[PDB]
Amino acid sequence: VALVYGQMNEPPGARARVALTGLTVAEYFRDQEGQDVLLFIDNIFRFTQAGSEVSALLGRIPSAVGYQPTLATDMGTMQERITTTKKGSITSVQAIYVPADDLTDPAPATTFAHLDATTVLSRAIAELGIYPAVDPLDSTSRIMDPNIVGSEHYDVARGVQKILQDYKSLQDIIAILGMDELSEEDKLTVSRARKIQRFLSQPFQVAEVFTGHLGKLVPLKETIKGFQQILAGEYDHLPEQAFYMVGPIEEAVAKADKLA
């Protein structure tokens, strides 16, 4: 990683440009060495704000909500340099701050014009111990189209979510009226869902110096199969905790063994 910094004490113009500087660097590992670089802009809102400060200083009339008249171009001239050219591609993970919790606020609204996916980190999920604490129902992607990820991928994914949704429904019932008017059917959606929820968690190699556990980098193929089978009913006999913090389904099997 190369780190580029635009600290909060820097004047508008500096916090304004540092995301371009970082961009410059990344474009090299693509236009000069044709790799697949990763660009991280933390956070995309302070980019926009820096834009407004600069704008105001240049005495230009603000537009709706006080932002810059050039909000959309200031953003476009930067966002657009982030793509897959014939030489390689830059992929950007942008930390978003939504003002006033207003998703139609000009800053945020403009920004979604460019996003192809959202990764929603959730404190609730974390509380399940589940990590990464990504929310499987709130996180989204433009490319989740069978015409793009292929029917299999697309169906598994849509399978995982519905089940996760259904279980969500039952969640209310379980706690109140108690876990049993539950059908041979309603009891399976839960079981699997709970297995799934866990199978969606995973050990990171970045946290090895700490979790005393080995990181896993599951492959896409392994991912779709994994969930495919749980949906399928291939491991309904396996127990929940067999799936907590593992990589490929094979590990779910072996953990079960060590868990008698």
């Binding site: 006080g66 606020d105 000009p106 109140i176």
Partner: protein, 263 residues
């Protein structure tokens, strides 16, 4: 449309939605249990009624309304009350009894000087034969030598429907001494006294067991809707809040610019 007021409203609706979703689930639980215990009750209650339909009973020549104490169950009470006033009018002497405080508060004032008794503690805990026996006893121990009475309650049909119905109380030990009753012989004039008393408790019990099933399914339904309306209201006020929030800033800023440019 003040960010203050909007916020005040959101505050009270988020709580309503919360308390209202809670009330729904509690009800659906009470309902579930009630729907089941109702299976046997019907057969039992329909059995009690098996004598009179299977063989005529009229009357030569007491309105009991059943519901509960708790509201927020759509039109459970208003229905029985509505039909209760209807009878008292069309009619022969008039005397009434209401089981469940709500009846005593609704088809009331107009007809207080037309009361005999009233019952409380109905609906929270599931009804029992025991409660029915108290109602029956309380009546037999009353100075009302009723010749004919009717019992008005809500007959369950499904979670989304019920029907206010009436059942005749020919309990008149006197009326059960008509021609049609000549078919059944070897009946002491006072064996009936026991028979009628009993069938009186059975009919009150039945109505009671039908009532809570209708009530818990209607409160469940009413609270489902209320909760869903709340959430929708929540979603709208929030969006109204952001539109307003953005316009105030824009509005306040254009005002500053106008003043500054004029100089």
């Amino acid at each position: 449309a003040t960010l203050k007021d909007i916020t005040r409203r959101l505050k009270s609706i988020k709580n309503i939605q919360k308390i209202t979703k809670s009330m729904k689930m509690v009800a659906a639980a009470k309902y579930a249990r009630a729907e089941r215990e109702l299976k046997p009750a019907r057969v039992y209650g329909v059995g009690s009624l098996a004598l009179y339909e299977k063989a005529d009973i009229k009357t030569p020549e007491l309105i009991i309304g059943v519901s509960s104490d708790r509201g927020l169950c759509g039109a459970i009470h208003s229905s029985v009350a509505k039909q209760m006033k209807s009878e008292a009018a069309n009619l022969k002497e008039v005397k009434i009894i209401g089981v469940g405080d709500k009846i005593r508060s609704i088809l009331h004032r107009t007809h207080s000087d037309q009361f005999l008794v009233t019952f409380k503690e109905v609906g929270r805990r599931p009804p029992t034969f025991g409660d029915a026996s108290v109602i029956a006893l309380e009546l037999l121990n009353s100075g009302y030598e009723f010749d004919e009475g009717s019992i008005i309650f809500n007959r369950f049909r499904s979670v989304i429907s019920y029907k206010t119905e009436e059942k005749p109380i020919f309990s008149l030990d006197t009326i059960s001494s008509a021609e049609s009753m000549s078919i059944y012989d070897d009946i002491d004039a006072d064996v009936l006294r026991n028979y009628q008393e009993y069938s009186l408790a059975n009919i009150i019990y039945y109505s009671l067991k039908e009532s809570t099933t209708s009530e818990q399914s209607a409160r469940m339904t009413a609270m489902d809707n209320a909760s869903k309306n709340a959430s929708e209201m929540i979603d709208k006020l929030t969006l109204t809040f952001n539109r307003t929030r953005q316009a105030v800033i824009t509005k306040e800023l254009i005002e500053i610019i106008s003043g500054a440019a004029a100089l």
